[PDB]
Paper text:
Our BTTA-PEG-HTL ligands exhibited favorable HaloTag binding properties, as confirmed in a competitive binding assay. However, the BTTA-HTL ligand did not show high CuAAC catalytic activity for azidocoumarin and propargyl alcohol as a substrate when bound to HaloTag, despite showing good catalytic activity in the free form. As expected, HaloTag-TM expressing cells showed no desthiobiotin-alkyne labeling with BTTA-HTL.
Therefore, we aimed to develop a genetically encodable click reaction (GEN-Click) system that can selectively target the CuAAC reaction catalyst proximal to the protein of interest and that can be genetically expressed in live cells. Therefore, we developed the “GEN-Click” system, which can target the copper(I)-catalyzed azide/alkyne cycloaddition reaction catalysts proximal to the protein of interest and can be genetically expressed in a live cell.
Residue numbers in the entry: 4 to 297
The structure:
Amino acid sequence: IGTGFPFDPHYVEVLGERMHYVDVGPRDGTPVLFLHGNPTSSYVWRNIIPHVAPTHRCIAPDLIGMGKSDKPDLGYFFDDHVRFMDAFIEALGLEEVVLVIHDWGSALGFHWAKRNPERVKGIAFMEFIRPIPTWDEWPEFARETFQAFRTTDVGRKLIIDQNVFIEGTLPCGVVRPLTEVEMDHYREPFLNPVDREPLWRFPNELPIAGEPANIVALVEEYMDWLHQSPVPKLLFWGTPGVLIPPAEAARLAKSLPNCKAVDIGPGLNLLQEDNPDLIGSEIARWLSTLEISG
Ligand SMILES: CCCCCCOCCOCCOCCn1cc(CN(Cc2c[nH]nn2)Cc2cn[nH]n2)nn1
Ligand SMILES: [Cl-]
């Protein structure tokens, strides 16, 4: 599994800030937009993009406050990420897109799709944000940690002062051991403790046990839209998963229209780090089938 990040930096100005993105592949055709989540960056897509770049433009931004994107003094609410991602997409002048989305990247991508349904030609997704009705529906091994994350004093001490989301939670989201080179890539944007605000706000935005109520409502609405939409769908899942256990992936594979589901084997949250070749190869082949009438 490759540790390098061999992508030239591209930058675009967005609402007075600068955002970084990977941009490879041909200039024409429908672009494939890759959206990472917490606590990653476009680095998480590094071994998936090469399977897709021969046939499609691949665009992989770093969320505001993350990766190589700028770090304004925001709260980094989900609302803030929505604002910047909306403006990022318009700044590149994208028209129709295929979405490849993960974790908080999936909340951004589904929320954007719901509002721009004519511009989404397909959605590939994995370990994505859905409403978690009670804490019993959160994986037992991660319950006490995320419950502590969702406090102001203790959670900020863990995530901001002690960098637990990077040093502890992140490697706990991968079945295989991350190498020191891979850890340093994930560590790079957050070496300065003050810059770890998004890492703490994100778990406090998670729609768990009905709170925060604004995020729960928004996530419910895009899951409603997703069950209504004929858009082609590709769902990757692993065992045991974190956000999406296998029983839930099996349920969604039938309840979502026009949905193909792919078992990646063992996996927790960063499925991309456990089986990038399967995910990248299946995305590339699925993209081809989107051009077949039938
Ligand atoms: C869905 C969004 C992305 C999901 C990412 C993948 O999710 C995997 C789930 O990961 C759960 C495990 O989390 C990290 C495990 N872990 C435990 C500790 C030990 N202490 C944490 C703690 C304290 N009290 N309780 N816990 C650190 C400490 C120092 N001083 N005081 N405490 N460090 N790390
Ligand atoms: Cl999170």
